[PDB]
Design a protein around this ligand. Sequence first.
Ligand SMILES: *[C@@H]1O[C@H](CO)[C@@H](O[C@@H]2O[C@H](CO)[C@@H](O)[C@H](O)[C@H]2NC(C)=O)[C@H](O)[C@H]1NC(C)=O
Ligand SMILES: *[C@@H]1O[C@H](CO)[C@@H](O[C@@H]2O[C@H](CO)[C@@H](O)[C@H](O)[C@H]2NC(C)=O)[C@H](O)[C@H]1NC(C)=O
Ligand code: NAG
Ligand code: NAG
Ligand code: NAG
Lengths: 49, 280, 387, 82
Amino acid sequence: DGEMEELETLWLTGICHNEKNEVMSSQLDIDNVAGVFYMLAAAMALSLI
Amino acid sequence: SNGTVSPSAFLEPFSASVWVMMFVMLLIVSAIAVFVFEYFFTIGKAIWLLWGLVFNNSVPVQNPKGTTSKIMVSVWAFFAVIFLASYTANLAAFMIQEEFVDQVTGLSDKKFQRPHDYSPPFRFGTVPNGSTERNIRNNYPYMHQYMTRFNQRGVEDALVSLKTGKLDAFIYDAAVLNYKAGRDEGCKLVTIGSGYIFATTGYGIALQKGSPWKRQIDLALLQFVGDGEMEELETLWLTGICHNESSQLDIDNVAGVFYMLAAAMALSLITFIWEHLFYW
Amino acid sequence: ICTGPNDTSPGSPRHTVPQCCYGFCIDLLIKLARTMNFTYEVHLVADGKFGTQERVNNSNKKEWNGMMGELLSGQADMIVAPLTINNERAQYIEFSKPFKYQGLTILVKKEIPRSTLDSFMQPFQSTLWLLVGLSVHVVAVMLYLLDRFSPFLTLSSAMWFSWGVLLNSGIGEGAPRSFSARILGMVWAGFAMIIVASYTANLAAFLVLDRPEERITGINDPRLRNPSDKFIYATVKQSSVDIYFRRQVELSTMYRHMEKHNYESAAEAIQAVRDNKLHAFIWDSAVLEFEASQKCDLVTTGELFFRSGFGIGMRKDSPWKQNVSLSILKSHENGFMEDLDKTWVRYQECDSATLTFENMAGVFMLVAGGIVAGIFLIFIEIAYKRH
Amino acid sequence: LDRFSPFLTLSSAMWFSWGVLLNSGIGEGAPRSFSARILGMVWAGFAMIIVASYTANLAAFLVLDRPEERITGINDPRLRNP
Ligand SMILES: *[C@@H]1O[C@H](CO)[C@@H](O[C@@H]2O[C@H](CO)[C@@H](O)[C@H](O)[C@H]2NC(C)=O)[C@H](O)[C@H]1NC(C)=O
Ligand SMILES: *[C@@H]1O[C@H](CO)[C@@H](O[C@@H]2O[C@H](CO)[C@@H](O)[C@H](O)[C@H]2NC(C)=O)[C@H](O)[C@H]1NC(C)=O
Ligand SMILES: *[C@@H]1O[C@H](CO)[C@@H](O)[C@H](O)[C@H]1NC(C)=O
Ligand SMILES: *[C@@H]1O[C@H](CO)[C@@H](O)[C@H](O)[C@H]1NC(C)=O
Ligand SMILES: *[C@@H]1O[C@H](CO)[C@@H](O)[C@H](O)[C@H]1NC(C)=O
């Protein structure tokens, strides 16, 4: 009859069950740009060679 | 409406005071600053160089021969690239923003009040033998007399008439129309004023005069509304999928830019003519 | 001319002062007196509380207080006020047809956005800025380091070329000559475009979806559901909202917070909300909406719940009830309550454009700082010319 | 304007305009008239506006591309009204 879902969402429910509801706006770290930085370093090395 | 109102382009992104101030005074001050650096070559050439490097790359112009002037134009070009990036981001956000429109607002609109003084007569009516018709007749007899021509038969008949286009407005009970709009597919039908209500009345359970059940019924209804049963009953029945929730832009969206450019080369042509007469 | 207590604060002598009352309820009462002719003598209740069934210190006795304490004791004959109708109030007195339909909701102080000075450089980390600057300097020096020893570009020329290509300006018109220098310049231009494109993308990401606290989803908000020390939310003590919170069983944990913090009147609560002392105020939709219309920096966000209406009550049996109900229903039928709503509720000044001047005043401040440092730079250039 | 200047052919002007629209950087189309240069400047600003609008509209188009509208279980509104 469906009382179980109501009772578990009234008692067993939690606050951490959203899991896909944060804007999480943030900056760019060093490691994220480290890829193109390493590409640039390799370009410099090949220019020298 | 077929096409909702489009929010103004390039007005929200930058304030007009900001527009004029950072297109006039900052440029004038920077030109005076760079000309003295170059002197220690021409005011006009420096102004043209700085204006060209404001927006983006153009045909190369003679670069300043002073190191401090080069520093100045570089720190200006940093502001230039941040201006370009911000002008991209703010239009992106403004594209993200939604849009909505209402055809008419309120019942006292002149379209309702005087349907005669319009090239197309305004089509509105209601089902007779109801509270809405009696209220309209008691308040505005002329409205009732006019709507008798565009009368309706039933609720579904009115909805299909609005869908086809035979009728323009349908006055009826707020709850019934709200339910119909919520359950309607495509949400092509909407209330005026974003839920505007005029009669602000309710539904009551009729009873015989002096009936002993009046007090008990009133107490039961108050108990139910105080224990919140009305809420889940409304969610079960009165909930509508339409309420409680611009891929591309056309030429008209950017028409202001095109017209500004039109005035731009018009001013350029008149400046050319003025220079020729001045030389003459 | 309405007589009332002078001081709302408890512990003070409440002398009956003859102030003057006006507004929605007063005009409604005047209209009712015009319909059926009867002289009215308006006075304010001694205690600002609306009146709830309260267990006095004397046990085994339920007592009505406030304006209902005035009315039920015979000290009043009719009440005109934004009084919420509920079961407890309907048990002891009979209410007329409601003159304003409304419901409970939440008012919160609107969080105006704050723009810092580092808004322009916000998307990139300070460490990222330092790294890209050091990379710029080292590559710029090694351009002419490689070009100088090429039998087949100087300090200033290579430096200005580097700044121009990383800056999308073109300040340095001198160009690399050796093939390795050409490839290096092309790759550096590509890296500069990648940097600027990623920076534009990060501005786009940060600018949009910028809301630190989304909203309160009515009463079902999990943050509102769980009481906490920082989230201090309250309502007017000893009123209809208190009765509704207490009686309905599931909400009783919320009631556990209620007695912790309360305010004597709605004015104190809204002042506390304005002064950021309260995080949320629970009150009637009409009052809070009017306050939001007037107090333009406060917003009503909670979903409308507990739908009811303001009613004018009298004693258990009164000859007025049928006639006053008929007259108020007639007033609803014609264009009268709409006029009151227009002239006392509807009017407003602001209720609530992007990237204003205050948003990134940092860029104009940086340009001004460059302008005022240009004199220092030219002085340094003159001093270098001296040497 | 350049032809009637008091003191660059048609193809050169065409290539100037095309390099304004798209930032190739070919240049080599510098006009000699005052009004011609200022018009090229303002037209370059307008070309920047056009390309920025293009980028913004493309971003707006490709950030949201969900026509599927995945069913949210039994709570989906489409289930209520078949
Ligand atoms: C509103 O009431 C009038 C009055 O009864 C209805 O008019 C009747 O309509 C039926 C069906 O067309 C006729 O058989 C009767 O002779 C009509 N009576 C009169 C007095 O004209 C009318 O149909 C009702 N309208 C609605 C929508 O219910
Ligand atoms: C409520 O209003 C009704 C309608 O006017 C009043 O009933 C009339 O009262 C007058 C004077 O008492 C009589 O002359 C009429 O014959 C009555 N008409 C009817 C249809 O009853 C009634 O007195 C009013 N009651 C109150 C308490 O104001
Ligand atoms: C557009 O307007 C017509 C009437 O001109 C109407 O029939 C139609 O429903 C409207 N909407 C669409 C999507 O065509
Ligand atoms: C009411 O109180 C105020 C200040 O508390 C005082 O100025 C005023 O005189 C008082 N009213 C009367 C009638 O004394
Ligand atoms: C006004 O009051 C008088 C008595 O004071 C009463 O006779 C009359 O019915 C009332 N209503 C009127 C005059 O409309």
